[PDB]
Amino acid sequence: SMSVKKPKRDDSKDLALCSMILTEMETHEDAWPFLLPVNLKLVPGYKKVIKKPMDFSTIREKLSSGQYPNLETFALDVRLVFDNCETFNEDDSDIGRAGHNMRKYFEKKWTDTFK
Numbered sequence: 001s002m003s004v005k006k007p008k009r010d011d012s013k014d015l016a017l018c019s020m021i022l023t024e025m026e027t028h029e030d031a032w033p034f035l036l037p038v039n040l041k042l043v044p045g046y047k048k049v050i051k052k053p054m055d056f057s058t059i060r061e062k063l064s065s066g067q068y069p070n071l072e073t074f075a076l077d078v079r080l081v082f083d084n085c086e087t088f089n090e091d092d093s094d095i096g097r098a099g100h101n102m103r104k105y106f107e108k109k110w111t112d113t114f115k
Contacts, residue, residue, distance in 0.1 A: 018068070021106070025106060028105060030102055033085065035055065035056050037053060037055045045088075050088060052080060054081045062077070082100075
């Protein structure tokens with residue numbers, strides 16, 4: 001509260017560490033469904049159904065231009081990528097399995113880096 005603060009957690013390396021994680025996600029072999037924005041002209045249903053599209057290129061640009069105020073907003077966009085994927089894709093499809101795999105990969109790096 002006012003004039004009463006928890007000890008200051010060092011957050012000076014967060015930007016660098018989120019970039020590293022994002023690099024690891026970008027280079028994973030199962031990243032291909034997620035590298036670029038879904039083409040809303042070419043994929044029926046996507047525009048109407050997925051209220052907040054997100055992809056790795058868009059996260060990389062936001063990261064690079066100071067549009068994440070803290071590491072929680074970064075994790076929210078990453079998770080949005082996989083939540084969108086589960087909304088639109090069957091679990092037993094290549095893309096559906098890609099998304100589960102990538103979410104697992106991310107969540108481990110996130111825990112190991114920050115928790």
